Design a protein around this nucleic acid. Structure first.
Ligand code: SAM
Lengths: 98, 91, 107, 75, 383, 93, 107, 93, 95, 87
DNA sequence: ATCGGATGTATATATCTGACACGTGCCTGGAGACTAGGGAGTAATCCCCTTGGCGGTTAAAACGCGGGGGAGAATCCGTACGTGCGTTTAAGCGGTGCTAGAGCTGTCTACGACCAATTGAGCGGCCTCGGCACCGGGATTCTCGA
DNA sequence: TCGAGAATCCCGGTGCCGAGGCCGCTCAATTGGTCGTAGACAGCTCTAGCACCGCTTAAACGCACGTACGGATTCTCCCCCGCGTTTTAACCGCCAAGGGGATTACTCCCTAGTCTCCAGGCACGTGTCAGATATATACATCCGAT
């Protein structure tokens, strides 16, 4: 049969790959559109200087990555390797965000 | 047959699905996550939306005080610094 | 009356004059001492030297002669004290330290 | 009988007659609650009651509801 | 298999002679000149249902960016509304069975040839229908789809506002004079909530391009629908939109009531607004970003409001810390019963999310809610 | 107009520490932001210290105390020693 | 002329004059607007009025006519907005609200 | 020396909202510390806002924006309402 | 004899509805003094300062134990264990 | 006993019932035996940080008395603002 | 456990290439040199608040002994998430054009700083009484083992 | 379910000490002047953010296999709760001395201010080589079969 890696091997491979890299893991245009929609709530038309959207993407990716580190720690504390929404909720509750 | 609208502005749709499942998967993988539950994607989309609304609200408030129509990088940096999320490399 | 910069008097690379002007115009106090900008410039120079030393070590570990944001991130987060100082700070294009939880690795 | 509502949400009962004037009501409120006359303003049906006028001028009905406003500081 | 129109959508019951039967029976030839869809920026001609001599050109091509305007969707909507509203039986049945399946299939599959053939066969089948039967049916109509007036107003909008939509972005300030529209769905919802009826008066403070004025005058039959605007670009666009509306309303036989605009002059310190506030039955003020000074000016204007007048707004007219100590006994805001409701999705043109909107009814007496301290709170406390 | 920054001095310190190593524009901007942020932290802490002691001036003592409060551990000790060296050398000439 | 406090002019209980003097002497800026102290005093008075109203409600619910730190703690934490404003704040002698997790309750 | 505080004004607001409720010394000190802390927060935020815009004046606009940034949600709206009402009442005098 | 978990819940109710300091005053004062003896100068520790330290420490430990209890419940346990405290301090950013 | 009474360990002075009460106020039904030493260590670290900051304030003020305002400012620095002792 | 197959990826070398480093004009901020005010250093005094002790009481801590209830380990289910593959989607690159919003420069007029005289708001001290703490006793409500 | 039994709540009375209100007495807020300049408005420049289109192909998405890990069940067992007795030290109350934290008064050196001089660094421009990217290959790692 075709050579197939067991579950969790390629997961570790992507962990090693993306931990040594620095490029943005959220694509630029979808995040820009999300930012513009979130700013569409105000009736004024806003322009979002190109560095500002990039800075928002840096901050959002860093926040989500730290959140997933905390979520992984919570899941590993619960004798599990699969993060679940309960884990994110616990991480944000302990952090003081909820 | 499909209807349409579009008034004076291109009203962007929900556009949080643009933060795709592989994108959240990559973000988790960078965080050291080996396995991701299927409900992580919607929850993380909600968390990202809440965080972005907070940061963009602060940045647009800073822009409002400056009497500007442009959210400069300095506005985002100051909004993030206000939340304790101090960002370097943009000012 | 030759002009000699105060940074030259203090043997500092950083701008004692600009630091004094920033302290005066920063609305930190009604007045600013004469020795205060020298001290603050010295502290800033020392911290910058620390970050650049560790970042250059990281760059040499990667066989690269230009310090990039990734090297600054490695320098900050691999040093406990600097990471504690910059704990609440996000470095753009810095990434994350390579780490994986022990139980996640295969048996 | 009539009722009066105050800004603190307290309902206070008054026993008066249609021929009664606003001034005696004002002193009646004063003696039951201690609020002096000059600080209190009366409102009915979106209309402010005048001291020179009387209850029958405004055509008060039985078991009606008035409103009392206290002059705290003004402008 | 989908339709351009929601055939099962809400049906608005006509409360006045919306379709001018006398005008249609007395006039058989159309002389107006609406902005042709072809002039906006393969062609197909849509034949006017009521007037034989009018035919509108549409650039039917499924290869352009339809983000700004979709002529094929408009043609489908118009043919469906002819099938639904403007055609009596048995003609409605044949028009429904023959064209709509083919037309919808062509639209879904982007079949330009099929779409043009559907348009041509539709025009041929309408031409043989007597005009007498159509005008008789329009006379006997008592309800029509809620989306019909919405799509009609959007057609007028596309003829009028899209060619110069960017001119609406010339507002200079961030917290005043900023332009934002309320979609016709929200307008129908609030007009139903506020019980606009024949003989009522509607004022719109800051009408922008006058969407609310024209929509009220159309789907509520107000005796006079008024709108005041300051911006020059929005004023010129209002003039263009009203002219296009009059032409289109004459095209479809729809009566247009008295619509009045006070353009290029603020409603504050305005004589016409001052004399029209007493007779208003509904007052719509889009105060989403009005500053506190303009809110005070609106309060000053609304002092002369009558009893029963309902005031629609995106933010509360009364400041949420409003009280009654000295300068409020003679004020109107004490008599305002404020009721909050939640905006639905796609209710406003500036965003998809939504929010909240308040209807303030002018009461005969002072509002009883403000007296209770519970109401004044933002939203027990014990261990 | 002129937009001042700590780029030249960061470069000078870099060539002092690592003669053969350059620095990229993004890294230079991050180092500039770091210098500005630490300057703001130390200056704000010194301002708070001056206000608490009812002092209108920021002399070297407030900056030294702010460094002690802000920098953790050996960073504070080394920064304080460097600042003392700088002040002594500056006053000597 | 007869002195009239600016707090009386603004209809504020809080000291607009003291707020202006604190802004000037706090060195928040080189110059301080005339309407700034009125605005800041009004905001402070509003926040104090809200917290005192909720604390007095707590005291009344506890059959006490004197506000203590416990009532302030209950008022602050029971209200989402005030708690979020004072999230990082410790109120002395306040304790913590009654909150037992449902898992801990007996089966 | 005279140790100033917001005690009398906190008491006045207490009697405004709750005429028949007192407040203890510890609660009084907590309220005074709260007023001082929020004053410092809003003043510092307005100072940062003025510095960012290169403006030397703390106007009502700066304090309004600072109050919008600091207070969450409905608290910000009501505080802005109170501040605007107070400024409007004061300027018309 | 009440079963296990009953008097514990009664204590939770007793100490959540009460505000008195849960650490004895003098032992905490002595602890604070030793923690400050690392500096050679003999400090005087104004009694309100010791009280403020006790307030802050008790509030911090109460919040830490709330987080620890949440962590323990997350792990399908009711007994808090040192790994719960370590997780709480790690997630908070204190370690 | 030389010139000043060097205090003994006095971290056991935070007794087991005291840590139990602190946990109970936090809504803890059961406590592991090892929670006590862990809590002692965490409290020691926190007190070390806060008292180091307060003593830094005091020595800057050229005082030998750790005033309550020093503790309040130290806690405010650490994002743990304390109300009731001035500020 | 160990031997091959397939895979990813690491190393290596070659060829770009645009961002980094260095050179130069100059101009705007830094530096030298008075001048004068006042904030800060230093000295003297008061007395508040700290240390230390001491002794008696009494709540709380520590120790010890059941025991049962929750932690942890082992087993088994099944389903839900990981991994490839083929398809579809649209992001990213890469050009062009619009024009309008950020930035800079030039009035000048309102506005806030500063200063002097005035006095009522606000704070330090001292009654003083009533809301809250303590204590005895009775009613209430929950808990547990039958 | 019932009974017995322990916290817990409440009712009343007593006691107390600290919140509230009053009285001076400062001195900081208010009023009334000028006068420097911050910034609001207007005009001009110009460059960057919006918008559009087309093509390549990297990435998203749907589906299918399967396997391993999340959840449930069951068992042991040991450790931590609850209760009782002894012990220990906190606590309160009271005494005392005196360390140094406020406070005031004097002097005077340091720093704001301003004026002039000048050179250090920021904008602009151009060389050129570190790094990225291309391919191509060696080597390490995972996994299936024996
Ligand atoms: C958000 S738009 C609402 C447009 C329209 N009423 C609607 O809902 O579709 C607000 C409009 O009010 C106008 N406006 C704002 N302030 C005004 C004033 N003071 N006098 C007259 N019009 C004003 C502006 O021109 C702007 O177009």
């Amino acid at each position: 049969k075709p050579h197939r890696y067991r579950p969790g091997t390629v997961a570790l491979r992507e962990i090693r790959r993306y931990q040594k890299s620095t490029e943005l893991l959220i694509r630029k245009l979808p995040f820009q559109r999300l930012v513009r929609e979130i700013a569409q709530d105000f009736m004024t038309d806003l322009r979002f200087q190109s560095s500002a959207v990039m800075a928002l993407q840096e901050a959002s990716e860093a926040y989500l990555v730290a959140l997933f580190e905390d979520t992984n720690l919570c899941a590993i504390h619960a004798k599990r390797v699969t993060i679940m929404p309960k884990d994110i909720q616990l991480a944000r509750r302990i952090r003081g965000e909820r | 047959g499909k209807g349409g609208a579009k008034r004076h502005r291109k009203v962007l749709r929900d556009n949080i699905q643009g933060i795709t499942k592989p994108a959240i998967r990559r973000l988790a993988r960078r965080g050291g996550v080996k396995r991701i539950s299927g409900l992580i994607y919607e929850e993380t989309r909600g968390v990202l939306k809440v965080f972005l609304e907070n940061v963009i609200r602060d940045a647009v408030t800073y822009t409002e005080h400056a009497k500007r129509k442009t959210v400069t990088a300095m506005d985002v940096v100051y909004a993030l610094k206000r939340q304790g999320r101090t960002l370097y490399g943009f000012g | 009356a030759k002009a000699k910069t105060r940074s030259s008097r203090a043997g500092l690379q950083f701008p004692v004059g600009r630091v004094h002007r920033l302290l005066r115009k920063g609305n930190y106090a009604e007045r600013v001492g004469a020795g205060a900008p020298v001290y603050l410039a010295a502290v800033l120079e020392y911290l910058t030297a620390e970050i650049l030393e560790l970042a250059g070590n990281a760059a040499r570990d990667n066989k690269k002669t230009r310090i990039i944001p990734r090297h600054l991130q490695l320098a900050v987060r691999n040093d406990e004290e600097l990471n504690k100082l910059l704990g609440r700070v996000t470095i753009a294009q810095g990434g994350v330290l390579p780490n994986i939880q022990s139980v996640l690795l295969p048996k | 009988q009539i009722f009066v509502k105050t800004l603190t949400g307290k309902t206070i009962t008054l026993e008066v007659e249609p021929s009664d004037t606003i001034e005696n009501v004002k002193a009646k409120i004063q003696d039951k609650e201690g609020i002096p006359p000059d600080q209190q303003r009366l409102i009915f049906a979106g209309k402010q009651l005048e001291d020179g006028r009387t209850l029958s001028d405004y055509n008060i009905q039985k078991e009606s509801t008035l409103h009392l406003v206290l002059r705290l500081r003004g402008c | 298999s989908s339709t351009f129109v929601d055939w099962n959508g809400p049906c608005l019951r006509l409360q006045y002679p919306l379709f001018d039967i006398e005008y249609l029976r007395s006039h058989e030839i159309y002389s107006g000149t609406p902005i042709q869809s072809i002039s906006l920026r393969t062609t197909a001609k849509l034949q006017s249902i009521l007037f034989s001599n009018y035919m509108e050109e549409y650039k039917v091509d499924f290869k352009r960016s339809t983000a700004i305007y979709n002529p094929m969707s408009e043609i489908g909507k118009l043919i469906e509304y002819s099938c639904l509203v403007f055609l009596p039986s048995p003609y409605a049945e044949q028009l429904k069975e023959t064209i709509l399946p083919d037309l919808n299939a062509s639209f879904d599959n982007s079949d330009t040839k099929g779409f043009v053939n559907a348009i041509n066969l539709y025009n041929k089948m309408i031409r043989e229908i007597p005009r007498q039967r159509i005008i008789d049916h329009l006379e006997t109509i008592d309800k029509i789809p809620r989306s019909f007036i919405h799509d009609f107003l959007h057609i007028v909008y596309t003829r009028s506002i899209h060619p110069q939509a960017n001119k609406l972005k010339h507002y200079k300030a961030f917290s005043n004079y900023v332009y934002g529209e309320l979609l016709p769905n929200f307008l129908s919802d609030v007009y139903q909530q506020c019980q606009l009826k024949k003989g009522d008066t509607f004022m719109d403070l800051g009408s922008g391009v006058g969407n609310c004025v024209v929509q009220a005058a159309l789907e509520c039959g107000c005796a006079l629908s008024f709108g005041c605007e300051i911006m020059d670009d929005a004023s010129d666009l209002t003039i263009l939109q009203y002219e296009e509306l009059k032409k289109r309303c004459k095209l479809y036989g729809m009566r247009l009531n008295n619509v009045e605009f006070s353009l290029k002059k603020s409603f504050v310190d305005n004589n016409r607004v001052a004399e029209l506030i007493p007779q208003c039955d509904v007052i719509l003020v889009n105060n989403f970003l009005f500053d506190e000074d303009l809110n005070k000016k609106v309060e000053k204007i609304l002092q002369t409001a009558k009893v029963g007048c309902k005031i629609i707004s995106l933010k509360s007219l009364r400041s949420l810390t409003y009280q009654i100590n000295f300068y409020n006994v003679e004020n109107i805001f004490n008599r305002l019963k404020v009721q909050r409701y939640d905006l639905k999705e796609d209710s406003v043109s500036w965003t998809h999310s939504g929010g909240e909107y308040y209807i303030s009814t002018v009461m005969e007496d002072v509002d009883e809610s403000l007296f209770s301290p519970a109401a004044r709170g933002r939203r027990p406390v014990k261990y | 107009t002129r937009k001042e920054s700590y780029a030249i001095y960061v470069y000078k310190v870099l060539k002092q520490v690592h003669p053969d190593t350059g620095i990229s524009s993004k890294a230079m901007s991050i180092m500039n932001s770091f210098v500005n942020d630490v300057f703001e932290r130390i200056a704000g802490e010194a301002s708070r210290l001056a206000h608490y002691n009812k002092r209108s001036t920021i002399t070297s003592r407030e900056i030294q105390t702010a460094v002690r409060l802000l920098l953790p551990g050996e960073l504070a000790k080394h920064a304080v020693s460097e600042g003392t060296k700088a002040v002594t050398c500056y006053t000597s000439a």
